[PDB]
Design a protein around this ligand. Structure first.
Ligand SMILES: CC(C)=CCSP(=O)(O)OP(=O)(O)O
Ligand SMILES: [Mg+2]
Ligand SMILES: [Mg+2]
Ligand SMILES: [Mg+2]
Length: 521
């Protein structure tokens, strides 16, 4: 495979193989107790090894379904029901929210006594986030579960169990990124006395092994950044190359995706610079020229651009033409049209923002946001990821992406929202209206708290839609759908509060890229 301990690794190569095999045997063990089998799969996934046993995990889930599994314990234990529900759906299996109806009273509410078992509550909570539109029971399940977890103290349950709850409350499993979940779960798993030493070692090894790939990737990308040295010449621009790669890892963590990673990290870096040129540095007349230049994509015309924009455009022009050349050489297809198109759209979105600002405009939430998620660069990032993740491009798919299909628009919605939500307070208090939350206030004539709650709910409804795209009725390949969704995941993991906001970030970036995980004891 493209991720085996032979294609990547190479004696450690031998230690990995032995451990990996042992785990496979465990997932495939047909004499295993279903509940134990599911908790195994759960650990393997949280620990970050799920991709390596993708096939095995399905095999297991299939035998579980084909035999009905514990179709009787779906009335006996909430924990099992929730875990099985979450895992089955996670893997495309069909499951009904009615599998929980047997946990509600006459009035139609989850029994109170359930709160006693803090484990089953966490499992239900986690399962609620994989809901679709219409599944009210799951919506109620989350409201019910959070009400209990909120109160839980370290004393009531214990240091270990409490960390689990605070972790879930911070960000649900379904929404956190694979790597971020991995670093946390490993540290948490290595502390357990009953921790599987074989699995623990594989997790550690595999994590550091992949992490090395990242460093090698960020290494070449940095080579590029330096030669381009766009930040050093543009005294106003900010450098965010490392921040960009970290972002990229969220979107495409699988090692085999170095391409997609470098492609997103480069794009995000450029989005950063060009973003500033539009809302802080350039004048409308200049932005107007830049926008026009991107649309024409003519190098023999970069002379109509002011010095600094000329330097910026050329760097962009080449980087893109370079990506196009790669595809041509590897796919025998000319994808330049689509790529340059994505940029024309983003710049026009950026220009729309610049104009609204200069003209003191106050567009309705609907209009502002409709432009905001496009100016987030999310859809552009995905369009680029598409060509880097799928080996066989289909005319039909690219056309849909070009028209901003829900597969990339939806996750972009969240991206923009999580962002504006972070800057909401500051920008609002600073008298600014250039913020989704602010528009929602003015448009609905409501307080900040109310506006914020609505943004949150809007996000929840978006997730439900995304979950449907992933479950079924999709034109795109599941892989890309998960990549698209990853952008939403990364947005949730990137815009937070914390310790210090800037502190939790520095830590994560170091835990995800720089520093490896402490060796196995
Ligand atoms: C566009 C991105 C992803 C980052 C720069 S921060 P921002 O979203 O406030 O910038 P704009 O609203 O596009 O001017
Ligand atoms: Mg901007
Ligand atoms: Mg900005
Ligand atoms: Mg903003």
């Amino acid at each position: 495979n493209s991720w085996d301990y032979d294609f990547l690794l190479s004696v450690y190569k031998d230690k990995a193989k032995k451990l990996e095999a042992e785990v496979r045997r465990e997932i495939n063990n047909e004499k295993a107790e279903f509940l134990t089998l599911l908790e195994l799969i759960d650990n393997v996934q949280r620990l970050g090894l799920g991709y390596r046993f993708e096939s095995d995990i399905r095999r297991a889930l299939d035998r579980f379904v084909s035999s009905g599994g514990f179709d009787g314990v779906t009335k006996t234990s909430l924990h099992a029901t929730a875990l099985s529900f979450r895992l089955l759906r996670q893997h495309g299996f069909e499951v009904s929210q009615e599998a929980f109806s047997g946990f509600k009273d006459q009035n139609g509410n989850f029994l109170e006594n359930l709160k006693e078992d803090t484990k089953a509550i966490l499992s239900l909570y986690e399962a609620s986030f994989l809901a679709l539109e219409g599944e009210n029971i799951l919506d109620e399940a989350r409201v019910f579960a959070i009400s209990h977890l909120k109160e839980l103290s370290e004393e009531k349950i214990g240091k270990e169990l409490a960390e689990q709850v605070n972790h879930a409350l911070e960000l649900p499993l379904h929404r956190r990124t694979q790597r971020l979940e991995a670093v946390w779960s490993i540290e948490a798993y290595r502390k357990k006395e009953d921790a599987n030493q074989v699995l623990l070692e594989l997790a550690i090894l595999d994590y550091n092994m992949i992490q090395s790939v990242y460093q090698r990737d960020l290494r070449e990308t940095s080579r590029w950044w330096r030669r381009v040295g766009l930040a050093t010449k543009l005294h106003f621009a900010r450098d965010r190359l490392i921040e960009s790669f970290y972002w990229a890892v969220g979107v495409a963590f699988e090692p085999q995706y170095s391409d997609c990673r470098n492609s997103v990290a480069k794009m995000f870096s450029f989005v950063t610079i060009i973003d500033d040129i539009y809302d802080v540095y350039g004048t409308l007349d200049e932005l107007e020229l830049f926008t026009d230049a991107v649309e024409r994509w003519d190098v023999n015309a970069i002379n109509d651009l002011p010095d600094y924009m000329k330097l910026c455009f050329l760097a962009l022009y080449n980087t893109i033409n370079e990506i196009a050349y790669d595809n041509l050489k590897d796919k025998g297809e000319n994808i330049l049209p689509y790529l340059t198109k994505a940029w024309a759209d983003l710049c026009n979105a950026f220009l729309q923002e610049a104009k609204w600002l200069y003209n003191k405009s106050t567009p309705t939430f609907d209009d502002y946001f409709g432009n905001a998620w496009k100016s987030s660069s999310g859809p552009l990032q995905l369009i680029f990821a598409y060509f880097a993740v799928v080996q066989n491009i289909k005319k039909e798919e690219i056309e849909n992406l070009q028209k901003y299909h829900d597969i990339i628009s939806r996750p972009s919605h969240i991206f923009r929202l999580c962002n504006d939500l972070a800057s909401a307070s500051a920008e609002i208090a600073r008298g600014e209206t250039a913020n989704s939350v602010s528009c929602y206030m003015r448009t609905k004539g409501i307080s900040e708290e109310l506006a914020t709650e609505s943004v949150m709910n809007l996000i929840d409804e978006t997730w439900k839609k995304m979950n449907k795209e992933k479950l079924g009725g999709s034109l795109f390949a599941k892989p890309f759908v998960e990549t698209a969704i990853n952008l939403a995941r990364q947005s949730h993991c990137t815009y937070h509060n914390g310790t210090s906001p800037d502190e939790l970030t520095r830590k994560r970036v170091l835990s995800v890229i720089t520093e490896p995980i402490l060796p196995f004891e």
